[PDB]
Amino acid sequence: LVPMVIEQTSRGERSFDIYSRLLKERVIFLTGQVEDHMANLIVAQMLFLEAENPEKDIYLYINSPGGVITAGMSIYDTMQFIKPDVSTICMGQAASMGAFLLTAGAKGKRFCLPNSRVMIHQPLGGYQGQATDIEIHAREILKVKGRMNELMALHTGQSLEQIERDTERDRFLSAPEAVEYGLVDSILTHRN
Amino acid sequence: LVPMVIEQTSRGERSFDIYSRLLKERVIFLTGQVEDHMANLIVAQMLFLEAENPEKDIYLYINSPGGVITAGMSIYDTMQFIKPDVSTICMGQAASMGAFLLTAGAKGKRFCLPNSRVMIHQPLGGYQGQATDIEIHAREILKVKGRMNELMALHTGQSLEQIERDTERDRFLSAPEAVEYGLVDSILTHRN
Amino acid sequence: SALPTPHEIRNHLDDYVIGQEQAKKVLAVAVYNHYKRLRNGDTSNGVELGKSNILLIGPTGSGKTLLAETLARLLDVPFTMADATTLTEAGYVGEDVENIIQKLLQKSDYDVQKAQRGIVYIDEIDKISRKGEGVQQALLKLIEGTVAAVPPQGGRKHPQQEFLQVDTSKILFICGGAFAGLDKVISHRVETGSGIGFGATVKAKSDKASEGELLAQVEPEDLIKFGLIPEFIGRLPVVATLNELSEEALIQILKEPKNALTKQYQALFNLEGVDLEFRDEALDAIAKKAMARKTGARGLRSIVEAALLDTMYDLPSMEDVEKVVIDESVIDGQSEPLLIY
Amino acid sequence: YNHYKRLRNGDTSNGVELGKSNILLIGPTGSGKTLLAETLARLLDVPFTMADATTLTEAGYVGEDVENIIQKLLQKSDYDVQKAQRGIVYIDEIDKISRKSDNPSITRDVSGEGVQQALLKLIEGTVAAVPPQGGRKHPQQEFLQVDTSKILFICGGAFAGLDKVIS
Amino acid sequence: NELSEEALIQILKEPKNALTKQYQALFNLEGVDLEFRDEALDAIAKKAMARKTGARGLRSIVEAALLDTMYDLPSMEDVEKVVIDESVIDGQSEPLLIYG
Amino acid sequence: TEAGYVGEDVENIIQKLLQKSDYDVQKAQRGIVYIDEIDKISRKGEGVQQALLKLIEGTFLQVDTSKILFICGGAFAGLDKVISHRVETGSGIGFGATVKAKSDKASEGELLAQVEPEDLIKFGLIPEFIGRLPVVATL
Amino acid sequence: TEAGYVGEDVENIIQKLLQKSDYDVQKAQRGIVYIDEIDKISRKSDNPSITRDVS
Amino acid sequence: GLRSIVEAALLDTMYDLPSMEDVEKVVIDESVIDGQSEPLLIYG
Numbered sequence A, B: 001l002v003p004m005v006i007e008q009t010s011r012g013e014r015s016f017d018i019y020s021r022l023l024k025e026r027v028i029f030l031t032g033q034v035e036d037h038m039a040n041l042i043v044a045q046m047l048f049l050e051a052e053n054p055e056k057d058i059y060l061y062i063n064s065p066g067g068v069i070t071a072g073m074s075i076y077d078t079m080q081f082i083k084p085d086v087s088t089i090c091m092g093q094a095a096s097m098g099a100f101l102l103t104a105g106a107k108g109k110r111f112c113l114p115n116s117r118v119m120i121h122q123p124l125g126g127y128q129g130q131a132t133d134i135e136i137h138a139r140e141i142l143k144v145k146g147r148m149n150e151l152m153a154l155h156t157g158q159s160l161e162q163i164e165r166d167t168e169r170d171r172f173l174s175a176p177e178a179v180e181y182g183l184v185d186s187i188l189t190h191r192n
Numbered sequence C: 001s002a003l004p005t006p007h008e009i010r011n012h013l014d015d016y017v018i019g020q021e022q023a024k025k026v027l028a029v030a031v032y033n034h035y036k037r038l039r040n041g042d043t044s045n046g047v048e049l050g051k052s053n054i055l056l057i058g059p060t061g062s063g064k065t066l067l068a069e070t071l072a073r074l075l076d077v078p079f080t081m082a083d084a085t086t087l088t089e090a091g092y093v094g095e096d097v098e099n100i101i102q103k104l105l106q107k108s109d110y111d112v113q114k115a116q117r118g119i120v121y122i123d124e125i126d127k128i129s130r131k132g133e134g135v136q137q138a139l140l141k142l143i144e145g146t147v148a149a150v151p152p153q154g155g156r157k158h159p160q161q162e163f164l165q166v167d168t169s170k171i172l173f174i175c176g177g178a179f180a181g182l183d184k185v186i187s188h189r190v191e192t193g194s195g196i197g198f199g200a201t202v203k204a205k206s207d208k209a210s211e212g213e214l215l216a217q218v219e220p221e222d223l224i225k226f227g228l229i230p231e232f233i234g235r236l237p238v239v240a241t242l243n244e245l246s247e248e249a250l251i252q253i254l255k256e257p258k259n260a261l262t263k264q265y266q267a268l269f270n271l272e273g274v275d276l277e278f279r280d281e282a283l284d285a286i287a288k289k290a291m292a293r294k295t296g297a298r299g300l301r302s303i304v305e306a307a308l309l310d311t312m313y314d315l316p317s318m319e320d321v322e323k324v325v326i327d328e329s330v331i332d333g334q335s336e337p338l339l340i341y
Numbered sequence D: 001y002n003h004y005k006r007l008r009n010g011d012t013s014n015g016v017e018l019g020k021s022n023i024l025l026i027g028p029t030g031s032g033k034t035l036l037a038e039t040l041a042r043l044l045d046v047p048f049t050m051a052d053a054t055t056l057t058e059a060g061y062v063g064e065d066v067e068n069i070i071q072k073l074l075q076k077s078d079y080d081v082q083k084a085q086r087g088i089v090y091i092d093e094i095d096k097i098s099r100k101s102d103n104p105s106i107t108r109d110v111s112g113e114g115v116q117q118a119l120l121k122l123i124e125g126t127v128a129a130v131p132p133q134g135g136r137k138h139p140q141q142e143f144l145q146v147d148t149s150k151i152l153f154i155c156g157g158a159f160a161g162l163d164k165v166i167s
Numbered sequence E: 001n002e003l004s005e006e007a008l009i010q011i012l013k014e015p016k017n018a019l020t021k022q023y024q025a026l027f028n029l030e031g032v033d034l035e036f037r038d039e040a041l042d043a044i045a046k047k048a049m050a051r052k053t054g055a056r057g058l059r060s061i062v063e064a065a066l067l068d069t070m071y072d073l074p075s076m077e078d079v080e081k082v083v084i085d086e087s088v089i090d091g092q093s094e095p096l097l098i099y100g
Numbered sequence F: 001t002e003a004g005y006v007g008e009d010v011e012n013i014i015q016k017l018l019q020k021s022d023y024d025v026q027k028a029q030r031g032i033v034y035i036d037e038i039d040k041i042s043r044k045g046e047g048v049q050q051a052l053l054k055l056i057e058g059t060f061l062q063v064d065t066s067k068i069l070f071i072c073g074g075a076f077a078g079l080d081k082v083i084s085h086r087v088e089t090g091s092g093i094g095f096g097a098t099v100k101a102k103s104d105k106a107s108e109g110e111l112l113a114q115v116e117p118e119d120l121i122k123f124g125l126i127p128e129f130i131g132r133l134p135v136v137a138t139l
Numbered sequence G: 001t002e003a004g005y006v007g008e009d010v011e012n013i014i015q016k017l018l019q020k021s022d023y024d025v026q027k028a029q030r031g032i033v034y035i036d037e038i039d040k041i042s043r044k045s046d047n048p049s050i051t052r053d054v055s
Numbered sequence H: 001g002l003r004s005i006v007e008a009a010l011l012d013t014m015y016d017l018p019s020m021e022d023v024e025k026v027v028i029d030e031s032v033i034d035g036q037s038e039p040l041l042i043y044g
């Protein structure tokens, strides 16, 4: 069960959920697998924060084992669309989509924990049916990989070819290795 | 599980749901597989906005992998029947039904993000039973296919024969490619 | 002594206040009428002319007080003010509404004729709307005439000892306040009802003029959504909105006025024989400082004073100095104005 | 008309003791409730004073008392109890002293029920305890006595919500 | 009983303390007549009912329609009379100032 | 006290300085008047601040309040808190950059040095009271 | 009680002392004044400001 | 409550009776309390 907390204000005391309390502070939690329901929920939160203060940073904590690719591209567009900078923090585990959303943050505001794990690979999929349909789906997923790698190279800064070679198979990287690859800008060990 | 937020005004503080708070701003979310329960619920949101103000635009954010044909067509008649203009936004994925509901939006108000995928195909169906019954259902689904294409070609501006070839089989299209077909009018990348 | 035409009142008000051109016209005719009647008790008929109250709905640090204060000082009449948040109904610890009349009589110097021609200025009307309502009910009568009972004391044992009455049907009640949120309420009634989303309109381009033009379209129905009871709004027929002080305005606000902070230092430095100048670049920096702290023009006095404190401590200890030119770096504290004699 | 008659017949030589009928004005907002009171004084030849119930509180509190109403009537009646005992009153906003559905009598509504409980004898008749002095009269302990058994008392309000109760 | 549109029009002309008689008396101080077209009064009544302001809102409506007019009126001369009309209330025209 | 009370009045102080001035308006015109005990009457009494408006504006032979400089000492009680409500800003619950100094203090005298007119009224002061105090000395 | 009210005034404290001092100004100003129950005038009112705390 | 009934029943009667002339008696009946009828005047 999610506990409740009280927030003291001028008008008095207001009760909020633990997640709701952090939402007021421009902090969104990305937990579990990435699906359409979760992604649409996070998008509504991001747009909501823009209305209250379009000039303040937004904090996005990412902890996911991965998910559907369509959902991730939806969130990536939102980060580039809205004016305020989005700070992405990886805590625990970060898969292909988690990593792609991690490097899509504002340049210079990408943090990572010392014992955090980052995993990156190429998109997955499949199709069962006639050969003509398989060819169409085969070209579709191929375009997604190229579209994702091109964006990954922009934020990381590495060349497009390097992204292809390193993403042929699952690639696990730690916090220090992420900086060299360019997936993150700094590592948070202790306050100050 | 769903976070709650508050809207501070002179009257006081009121706790609202993240999805409910956006509904006040004439924003509807279409997430997950299409079904009777979710489709009917969306219709209720459309009617409620019409009652409050029949002159303000309605925003429809679509993210779905497709679904039942009958359930999807219910929304189309609801958007075209009421006076308010309905804005359709393609986010992440849009299948035959999701794309059908996308081009059905108000002209000049159909937007789609750059990293978005759109798929279109002929409607699906089936029936097991006597031969004479199969002919009835087989003849009915053909009307649906032709009826749906006529609407797709009219809103897009393309020709019916050209659309039939495109929708004969699964056709994947990107955001810029969608504009050529006429499914959308513009692409949103950044504010202003 | 024929009262001055509104044009004159505006031209005069412009001298000490730059901007808010629409509000100036409203507060010129509105008060020219409120006094043209008082100086003519009869009307060559049996008519009983009424009163028209003014509601100044402006943003914070816009100068609502300044307009009221300046309007009274240009003339020779009593002027008082108050704060709705420091008042409450009867039976509660909160200050009673009758207290406001006391201040008015004090300023009037124990006079009724003068007090009848006074201009009270209520403030902070917002935040006491529904969900309080009781406080807004009492004021509803005072603004539309009330024979109040005020203790006749404070003027060295006033000869009148019968709870001296004061007619409140001739006092211009300029009830102001900064309605935080009204701008959004109005936008949902005059334009797209979408505040959140990809097609909404987020206010982040520092469009300080937007609120001014938005408030100009205010209507009574808009106030009902804010909480204000319909009766109170009806008592205030005249409404004048004030724009938001822009960056260009700030630099301008202390340039033209006869009592500008810049000119003030020029006057005292000239008395000692030294000249004072303020490069326009310095002014541009000051403007950004005031927006960083959002202290309107109240903080401009502390900015320039702090920047010139050190300078004043050294000028009397010098000789042959006859000119000073403040630069942009002087205000931040990294430079000292060059002494070119 | 009836009031004026009672004045001419105030001697009441006839064994009967003519009573008084108090009015209760109910009207929508902005309809003219407080306007009719101000318009009647323009022609009346007897002391008439207006008041408000949103400023009245039970006895022994910081707010106002119900006896203040009779003090305002003397200012208009040149402190003549006889004349003041044959005047008309108009209590505006009589709808704001109504219990907020507090039928259980949880607490003391000094601004609601508390004020109503103090007027039950003023509208009927009682030897009111006028405030110490609000006129030429210098002392305070005098506590001028006045009878309110021939003083009409009009009460007007808006009763926002009563329309639903009726339906 | 709640006031109706018809009642509002009657309130603007019949009452001895009507707004028209009040503003008209004001314009007589400067030696200029103030005329109010009957068709204009109907517009004001509809506005009040649309704003839910009642009789008190009438003054507000008139002030907005006669604000600019009185801003220059005392500073000018050779103006014998003014004729307000429905278009003035709508805000698509200016009151004609007859000279004489 | 109030101008209608029996206790010490504002006119009383005018008399006090008149004696020191030798009944010379020229002397009492400029002579400094330091007001002490101003930190107890501070609005939480309430009536005193209202009874001081006259003395601030300056309302026997009456002596005009032309240049008799007024001063105050320790007037506010919790000004430091009011200042932090208008100068201290940042974030609450979060990581890194977000401030995490809600139970830690840095300096008390520094806050008073950066006091703003807004903060003054924010504690309960009135415009005229501070309207005639265009300077501030932070001790 | 404060001065003016119907209650006793602080000035009478010195009068009591004079009785012990036999009206001798010198001995009077060299006496000791024990004020008991000083904890009873610790004002508890919630800033009413209408009336005064005579005690 | 009785006073309310008599006043309401005779409210209209008192508003027009003083203006009228040549009237000596008045008789109220049960129908007047319901409003269906009006109280008659015995002129003379």
Ligand SMILES: Nc1ncnc2c1ncn2[C@@H]1O[C@H](COP(=O)(O)OP(=O)(O)O)[C@@H](O)[C@H]1O
Pocket: C016, C017, C018, C019, C059, C060, C061, C062, C063, C064, C065, C066, C123, C176, C177, C178, C245, C253, C296, C297, C298
């Ligand atoms: N146009 C202007 N010219 C000069 N000063 C201005 C102007 N607008 C605002 N101010 C400043 O605003 C202050 C008064 O604002 P204030 O009374 O605090 O408004 P409110 O009480 O409504 O917030 C004054 O100190 C004045 O210097």
Ligand SMILES: Nc1ncnc2c1ncn2[C@@H]1O[C@H](COP(=O)(O)OP(=O)(O)O)[C@@H](O)[C@H]1O
Pocket: D027, D028, D029, D030, D031, D032, D033, D034, D035, D036, D158, E011, E015, E055, E056
């Ligand atoms: N029937 C009416 N005739 C003329 N004026 C009216 C009428 N009703 C309301 N008013 C106007 O309304 C104002 C008084 O309103 P008020 O009597 O306080 O409303 P309410 O009685 O609903 O509180 C006056 O300025 C008056 O011109």
Ligand SMILES: [Mg+2]
Pocket: D030, D032, D033, D034, D035
């Ligand atoms: Mg009324």
